Design an enzyme around this catalytic site. Structure first.
Site, PDB file in Angstrom:
ATOM      1  N   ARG A 143       6.158  40.356 104.270  1.00  0.00           N
ATOM      2  CA  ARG A 143       4.856  40.950 104.193  1.00  0.00           C
ATOM      3  C   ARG A 143       3.859  39.975 103.508  1.00  0.00           C
ATOM      4  NH1 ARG A 143       3.534  45.911 100.320  1.00  0.00           N
ATOM      5  NH2 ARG A 143       5.069  44.599  99.173  1.00  0.00           N
ATOM      6  N   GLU A 171       2.153  36.605 102.078  1.00  0.00           N
ATOM      7  CA  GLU A 171       2.088  35.114 102.257  1.00  0.00           C
ATOM      8  C   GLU A 171       3.006  34.351 101.303  1.00  0.00           C
ATOM      9  OE1 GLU A 171       1.047  33.187 104.486  1.00  0.00           O
ATOM     10  OE2 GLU A 171       1.075  31.267 103.422  1.00  0.00           O
ATOM     11  N   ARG A 172       3.039  34.852 100.071  1.00  0.00           N
ATOM     12  CA  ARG A 172       3.815  34.421  98.901  1.00  0.00           C
ATOM     13  C   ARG A 172       5.347  34.345  99.277  1.00  0.00           C
ATOM     14  NH1 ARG A 172       7.703  36.139  95.846  1.00  0.00           N
ATOM     15  NH2 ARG A 172       7.668  36.082  93.520  1.00  0.00           N
ATOM     16  N   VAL A 229       5.791  46.964 107.278  1.00  0.00           N
ATOM     17  CA  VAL A 229       6.353  48.135 107.892  1.00  0.00           C
ATOM     18  C   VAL A 229       5.436  49.357 107.790  1.00  0.00           C
ATOM     19  CG1 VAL A 229       8.752  47.299 107.717  1.00  0.00           C
ATOM     20  CG2 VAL A 229       7.696  48.725 105.840  1.00  0.00           C
ATOM     21  N   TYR A 283      14.488  56.394  87.881  1.00  0.00           N
ATOM     22  CA  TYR A 283      14.458  56.009  89.256  1.00  0.00           C
ATOM     23  C   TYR A 283      13.526  56.905  90.050  1.00  0.00           C
ATOM     24  CZ  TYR A 283      16.391  53.729  93.346  1.00  0.00           C
ATOM     25  OH  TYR A 283      16.581  53.123  94.507  1.00  0.00           O
ATOM     26  N   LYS A 329      15.417  57.172  98.896  1.00  0.00           N
ATOM     27  CA  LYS A 329      16.732  56.767  99.323  1.00  0.00           C
ATOM     28  C   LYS A 329      17.588  57.901  99.833  1.00  0.00           C
ATOM     29  CE  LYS A 329      16.741  52.390  98.050  1.00  0.00           C
ATOM     30  NZ  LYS A 329      16.264  51.396  99.048  1.00  0.00           N
TER      31      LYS A 329
HETATM   32  N1  LIG Z   1      18.220  44.846  92.961  1.00  0.00           N
HETATM   33  C1  LIG Z   1      18.814  45.792  92.746  1.00  0.00           C
HETATM   34  O1  LIG Z   1      19.698  45.814  91.968  1.00  0.00           O
HETATM   35  C2  LIG Z   1      18.554  46.982  93.658  1.00  0.00           C
HETATM   36  C3  LIG Z   1      19.819  47.552  93.595  1.00  0.00           C
HETATM   37  C4  LIG Z   1      20.149  48.978  94.165  1.00  0.00           C
HETATM   38  C5  LIG Z   1      19.897  49.146  95.695  1.00  0.00           C
HETATM   39  N2  LIG Z   1      18.785  48.125  96.202  1.00  0.00           N
HETATM   40  C6  LIG Z   1      18.031  48.166  97.291  1.00  0.00           C
HETATM   41  O2  LIG Z   1      17.779  46.791  97.695  1.00  0.00           O
HETATM   42  C7  LIG Z   1      16.839  46.581  98.736  1.00  0.00           C
HETATM   43  C8  LIG Z   1      16.168  45.179  98.748  1.00  0.00           C
HETATM   44  O3  LIG Z   1      15.454  44.955  97.518  1.00  0.00           O
HETATM   45  P1  LIG Z   1      15.702  43.767  96.431  1.00  0.00           P
HETATM   46  O4  LIG Z   1      16.113  44.306  95.122  1.00  0.00           O
HETATM   47  O5  LIG Z   1      16.295  42.597  97.081  1.00  0.00           O
HETATM   48  O6  LIG Z   1      14.148  43.408  96.211  1.00  0.00           O
HETATM   49  P2  LIG Z   1      13.148  42.225  96.524  1.00  0.00           P
HETATM   50  O7  LIG Z   1      13.710  40.843  96.452  1.00  0.00           O
HETATM   51  O8  LIG Z   1      11.948  42.407  95.653  1.00  0.00           O
HETATM   52  O9  LIG Z   1      12.753  42.570  98.029  1.00  0.00           O
HETATM   53  C9  LIG Z   1      12.001  43.736  98.276  1.00  0.00           C
HETATM   54  C10 LIG Z   1      11.412  43.444  99.623  1.00  0.00           C
HETATM   55  O10 LIG Z   1      10.729  44.538 100.138  1.00  0.00           O
HETATM   56  C11 LIG Z   1       9.658  44.073 100.915  1.00  0.00           C
HETATM   57  N3  LIG Z   1       8.564  45.040 101.117  1.00  0.00           N
HETATM   58  C12 LIG Z   1       7.995  45.918 100.249  1.00  0.00           C
HETATM   59  N4  LIG Z   1       7.033  46.552 100.934  1.00  0.00           N
HETATM   60  C13 LIG Z   1       7.009  46.157 102.215  1.00  0.00           C
HETATM   61  C14 LIG Z   1       6.205  46.464 103.304  1.00  0.00           C
HETATM   62  N5  LIG Z   1       5.239  47.382 103.318  1.00  0.00           N
HETATM   63  N6  LIG Z   1       6.443  45.809 104.464  1.00  0.00           N
HETATM   64  C15 LIG Z   1       7.408  44.813 104.571  1.00  0.00           C
HETATM   65  N7  LIG Z   1       8.188  44.492 103.480  1.00  0.00           N
HETATM   66  C16 LIG Z   1       7.962  45.175 102.329  1.00  0.00           C
HETATM   67  C17 LIG Z   1       9.134  42.929 100.070  1.00  0.00           C
HETATM   68  O11 LIG Z   1       8.326  42.073 100.853  1.00  0.00           O
HETATM   69  P3  LIG Z   1       7.080  41.239 100.200  1.00  0.00           P
HETATM   70  O12 LIG Z   1       7.551  40.534  98.916  1.00  0.00           O
HETATM   71  O13 LIG Z   1       6.628  40.362 101.363  1.00  0.00           O
HETATM   72  O14 LIG Z   1       6.004  42.123  99.706  1.00  0.00           O
HETATM   73  C18 LIG Z   1      10.405  42.316  99.520  1.00  0.00           C
HETATM   74  O15 LIG Z   1      10.805  41.234 100.339  1.00  0.00           O
HETATM   75  C19 LIG Z   1      15.866  47.655  98.433  1.00  0.00           C
HETATM   76  O16 LIG Z   1      15.808  48.503  99.539  1.00  0.00           O
HETATM   77  C20 LIG Z   1      16.483  48.392  97.259  1.00  0.00           C
HETATM   78  O17 LIG Z   1      15.927  49.679  97.309  1.00  0.00           O
HETATM   79  C21 LIG Z   1      18.317  46.933  95.243  1.00  0.00           C
HETATM   80  O1  LIG Z   2      14.082  49.387  91.841  1.00  0.00           O
HETATM   81  C1  LIG Z   2      13.202  49.140  92.851  1.00  0.00           C
HETATM   82  C2  LIG Z   2      11.899  49.611  92.781  1.00  0.00           C
HETATM   83  C3  LIG Z   2      11.008  49.353  93.818  1.00  0.00           C
HETATM   84 CL1  LIG Z   2       9.324  49.967  93.714  1.00  0.00          CL
HETATM   85  C4  LIG Z   2      11.404  48.623  94.936  1.00  0.00           C
HETATM   86  C5  LIG Z   2      12.701  48.129  95.053  1.00  0.00           C
HETATM   87  C6  LIG Z   2      13.623  48.363  94.043  1.00  0.00           C
HETATM   88  O2  LIG Z   2      14.902  47.883  94.146  1.00  0.00           O
HETATM   89  C7  LIG Z   2      15.858  48.285  93.250  1.00  0.00           C
HETATM   90  C8  LIG Z   2      16.203  47.477  92.175  1.00  0.00           C
HETATM   91  C9  LIG Z   2      17.175  47.900  91.274  1.00  0.00           C
HETATM   92  C10 LIG Z   2      17.818  49.126  91.427  1.00  0.00           C
HETATM   93 CL2  LIG Z   2      19.066  49.625  90.237  1.00  0.00          CL
HETATM   94  C11 LIG Z   2      17.505  49.970  92.489  1.00  0.00           C
HETATM   95  C12 LIG Z   2      16.542  49.593  93.414  1.00  0.00           C
HETATM   96 CL3  LIG Z   2      16.128  50.670  94.790  1.00  0.00          CL
END
Ligand SMILES: NC(=O)c1ccc[n+]([C@@H]2O[C@H](COP(=O)([O-])OP(=O)(O)OC[C@H]3O[C@@H](n4cnc5c(N)ncnc54)[C@H](OP(=O)(O)O)[C@@H]3O)[C@@H](O)[C@H]2O)c1
Ligand SMILES: Oc1cc(Cl)ccc1Oc1ccc(Cl)cc1Cl
Ligand SMILES: NC(=O)c1ccc[n+]([C@@H]2O[C@H](COP(=O)([O-])OP(=O)(O)OC[C@H]3O[C@@H](n4cnc5c(N)ncnc54)[C@H](OP(=O)(O)O)[C@@H]3O)[C@@H](O)[C@H]2O)c1
Ligand SMILES: NC(=O)c1ccc[n+]([C@@H]2O[C@H](COP(=O)([O-])OP(=O)(O)OC[C@H]3O[C@@H](n4cnc5c(N)ncnc54)[C@H](OP(=O)(O)O)[C@@H]3O)[C@@H](O)[C@H]2O)c1
Ligand SMILES: NC(=O)c1ccc[n+]([C@@H]2O[C@H](COP(=O)([O-])OP(=O)(O)OC[C@H]3O[C@@H](n4cnc5c(N)ncnc54)[C@H](OP(=O)(O)O)[C@@H]3O)[C@@H](O)[C@H]2O)c1
Ligand SMILES: Oc1cc(Cl)ccc1Oc1ccc(Cl)cc1Cl
Ligand SMILES: Oc1cc(Cl)ccc1Oc1ccc(Cl)cc1Cl
Ligand SMILES: Oc1cc(Cl)ccc1Oc1ccc(Cl)cc1Cl
Lengths: 260, 254, 260, 255
Positions: free
Chosen positions: D39, D41-42, D66, D156, D163
């Site tokens: 999404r 540019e960054r 999206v 959360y 989710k």
């Molecule tokens: N990290 C954790 O421990 C946490 C753990 C529990 C489960 N999950 C699940 O992990 C998944 C991936 O997240 P992550 O932690 O890897 O985070 P992340 O590196 O910050 O990635 C989040 C991504 O969501 C994209 N995004 C947000 N709004 C969007 C939009 N309108 N259109 C297109 N892309 C959009 C962002 O794109 P831009 O940067 O281009 O805005 C970014 O690439 C999430 O669904 C999360 O809910 C993660």
């Molecule tokens: O926490 C979040 C909050 C936002 Cl607004 C978008 C993505 C995220 O990703 C995560 C990072 C850590 C854990 Cl425990 C759970 C999730 Cl869903």
């Protein structure tokens, strides 16, 4: 006798979502009234005000406190609950019996679902519980009970349910999150998962008659349920009998949840 | 909510038994109650404990759920003495101390099967025997714990016996729903009981509920007995196969 | 072609519960054999020893190492695994694909089940993982992975399945308790929840033909699964590809678990 | 097995520690051609540098928010026209307003609630629709969720409801699209330090709890998620659909 451990006699509950005499919310009304509870009814459509008026025969003596609330309007629920509060004072719970999705979406292949129709379903079928719980709490300074009505399609993918399935899964998570948040305030939050029941909204669900018949041949109890069976669980969940129960989902469904 | 009903309550050891909270609640609601106990030397805590409002005996029968004869002959006798019944409350489980202590992988075949036998299979025979006294239908309730759904720290073989009991419930509910007999479990939150002494780190599990459960308080025996009264009665008409968690909302969090 | 993400290839896996070539455990052996793995097989019956020898081509060189182990006997599984260790050295996982109940019971009205019947099913279908896991762990100083085979009947009350239903709820809890216990030892333990497949054991299930045709008509993917599909998910669980997965139950069932 | 000749669209990379970057690494090593969407540019500019890596162009970087029907439809058509048809999608997109997640659940604004659903849940629905047009013989869609969709977890909030919705979206999509030989599945990842994680209140305590209470007594990393994704995205998970695999050290299975 007093078997007021129920404690629900001369307590006041708000019942949202009576459309007509087959409404689940109506079997709840019937069962609470019979148990001595004072009742406040909210409606969206002018046709449902008319049915309420004719329905409140039964035993509540005003109004029974009929308020117009469209859950889509922030203003209407803020101001509806403020007015309940000024008119009957404080409240002891709320029975929530409001869902909506477009007929086209429900018909009708899931992957084809539009954004407006996805989000409309979440708006009315899930989020409404959240502002409703927020506004109602204000009339509940020593705690109370909120109960929402869900369907097994929020737990499993069910054939004609589509966008409503997703809206119920969301409703069901909303219930647990509201339970954790409002628990320290002595507010309990819960759901009844009802089996299928011929109602006005039910005829917007495709293959509805086939699913009735599945419960009949397949559910532990080899029958289906009616609105007053839901009303009786609502009564438990709203009463002090369910003292230790919050975040929970009670299937009033003849045991269909437990099988294959 | 009312009198006129006869329920068999299995599993009171003393005044802190969960089945005593059930007793109390049903007694106040006007039910006639029948009580089972395990060993003939504790018949006497029990009669002494039963004041309370029941007028005889209150119908006390010695049933160790390990014996096929004792469950059959027992219920046989109950039907003869008091006639037929509306429901049963099951509140029996047991495992060996050394098993729960005790690394799970080290469990013995006989200690495994003993927990299964006492904590699980007993609901099966008891439901078969009780059914004979329930010709219009009735309600059976068993007591379970969160460790039947999730692997919990010092619960071990009872954890596996409770998941057994929970599936036991669902199957009985299918088998017996045509006879009009409903079968449900109550997942109770931690309560300080005689049998709790066999559960390691119990102080720490109660403090955890206070800090973490939605309600931010532990449950009591009467709170269980209140959900039991719902289950046992007509209030829960369409519910069977279900597991109501009476646990301050703990099942629902993290 | 490294994987080498899989990390299966010069590793030894004990496979328990091959009767013939349609055994779910034979799907596992063909898939690990293909992936470069060394295999050790355990049988109970004689009839399986001759079945096994002939079946053991494939591309496994010695015996490949066939031990008679009847999971009813503590001695047989202690000595069995102790022999495996003397003969092949240490091991990397165990595929457990063993269950039994008296056909009289499953026949069969559940409340009528005998105590010996019910405890037999538990001993063999559930307790057997626990000593096996204990005895095998003594050959996994560096950790390892153990998979048992379950059925939807463990989670939902299913028509011809009864005491085995109850024995599989127990097995699944056994997998979760063993994961918690053995995890600090770096032993992962997991289950596969297989949909119906025409095996020699499937005979014991009343109306198998009918639960075949229901998957095909109702399951998301509109078709049945075979033994190599279970095998591939078993490779996944046994491999380092599921490095972060323990106590899990994966349904290899065309999506049946997720509906209605 | 386990190979090339496949093409996967990976959505939701921000930086070196995006979960989907772990998936990219794993797939890249297994020979797949990777198309990436972003999404900001960054994030594109983070993608370009991260691409060193094995993928030989572009890899095919597409701007897709999206939130717009238009951009997901036009993006996928363009993916079609540029690399031909496809074998799967990995979806790692979620959003919620920070105020909300802070922030008492009962106070959540209507618009904050529906924003969570729109981006975190509905996005999979249209993505699947448009993707399916490039998968005439079937494929595999994976979404990323979290235990908080199953249980009310502390800070959360609105994200847990999104989710829960996501998790149902996967099941209903699985039922709809399984005749079309498309499988749909979720990975419920444990907590991992990523850009978005620092938007979750007390993450640091929700990290250290896994280490002390999960069967495995450590947390996972982005590459462990990518190995499960590789399983789900390939034929190795042939009979598996509408399923949720916890790559979380066994946390889901305890107390
Ligand atoms: N990290 C954790 O421990 C946490 C753990 C529990 C489960 N999950 C699940 O992990 C998944 C991936 O997240 P992550 O932690 O890897 O985070 P992340 O590196 O910050 O990635 C989040 C991504 O969501 C994209 N995004 C947000 N709004 C969007 C939009 N309108 N259109 C297109 N892309 C959009 C962002 O794109 P831009 O940067 O281009 O805005 C970014 O690439 C999430 O669904 C999360 O809910 C993660
Ligand atoms: O926490 C979040 C909050 C936002 Cl607004 C978008 C993505 C995220 O990703 C995560 C990072 C850590 C854990 Cl425990 C759970 C999730 Cl869903
Ligand atoms: N019947 C069944 O089997 C069936 C099966 C399983 C679970 N459930 C659940 O049961 C609950 C109640 O439904 P029902 O079957 O009793 O049907 P019902 O008689 O049709 O009533 C549904 C109510 O929703 C109200 N409503 C819709 N949108 C609203 C809005 N924006 N604002 C305020 N009110 C609104 C309707 O109000 P107006 O008439 O005023 O428009 C109506 O009174 C639903 O939540 C349903 O999802 C029912
Ligand atoms: N306390 C809790 O925290 C707790 C909480 C969660 C859920 N659960 C479940 O609740 C139930 C009741 O336990 P409790 O905590 O209330 O403890 P309790 O008061 O000690 O009662 C346990 C009962 O089991 C009986 N029993 C054991 N083996 C028996 C046998 N072979 N035959 C007949 N009776 C037998 C005991 O009888 P005797 O003492 O007379 O020999 C005793 O009356 C158990 O099923 C338990 O697993 C309890
Ligand atoms: N087949 C399917 O539809 C199926 C479907 C869904 C889930 N599940 C589960 O899948 C598992 C595998 O069975 P299968 O269908 O592949 O059938 P199978 O080919 O009949 O294998 C069952 C194996 O169990 C072994 N066994 C039984 N008791 C034993 C004992 N006491 N000691 C050692 N081995 C013993 C049998 O050995 P002998 O013949 O030599 O006695 C046989 O090798 C079963 O656990 C079942 O519960 C099965
Ligand atoms: O289906 C519905 C559709 C809408 Cl638009 C509104 C309310 C509904 O209520 C129901 C009726 C029947 C069943 Cl089986 C399940 C539910 Cl949630
Ligand atoms: O733990 C027990 C152990 C045994 Cl041998 C017998 C009964 C028991 O009852 C309990 C007491 C406390 C908790 Cl938390 C859970 C349970 Cl099942
Ligand atoms: O059913 C069985 C019964 C027995 Cl006595 C032994 C093994 C079995 O294996 C199975 C075969 C088919 C299906 Cl559908 C499910 C299972 Cl557990």
């Amino acid at each position: 006798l007093a078997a007021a451990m129920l404690n629900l006699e001369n307590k006041t509950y708000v019942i949202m979502g009576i459309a007509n005499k087959r409404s689940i919310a109506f079997g709840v009304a019937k069962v609470l009234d019979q148990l001595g509870a004072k009742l406040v009814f909210t409606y969206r459509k002018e046709r449902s005000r008319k049915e309420l008026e004719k329905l409140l025969e039964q035993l509540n003596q005003p109004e029974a406190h009929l308020y117009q609330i469209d859950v889509q309007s922030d203003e209407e629920v803020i101001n509806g609950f403020e007015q309940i509060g000024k008119d009957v004072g404080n409240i002891d719970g709320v029975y929530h019996s409001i869902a909506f999705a477009n007929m086209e979406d429900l018909r009708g292949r899931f992957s084809e679902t539009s954004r407006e129709g996805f989000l409309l379903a979440q708006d009315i079928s899930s989020y409404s519980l959240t502002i409703v719980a927020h506004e109602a709490k204000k009339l509940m300074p020593e705690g109370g009970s909120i109960v929402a009505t869900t369907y097994l399609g929020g737990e499993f993918a069910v054939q004609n349910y589509n966008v409503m399935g997703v809206a119920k899964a969301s409703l069901e998570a909303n219930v647990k999150y509201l339970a954790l948040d409002l628990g320290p305030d002595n507010i309990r939050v819960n759901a009844i998962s009802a089996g299928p029941i011929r109602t006005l909204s039910a005829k917007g669900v495709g293959g509805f008659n086939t699913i009735l018949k599945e419960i009949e041949e397949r559910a532990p109890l080899k029958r289906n349920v009616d609105q007053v069976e839901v009303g009786k669980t609502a009564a438990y969940l709203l009463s002090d009998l369910s003292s230790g129960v919050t975040g929970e989902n009670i299937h009033v469904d003849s045991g269909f949840h437990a099988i294959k």
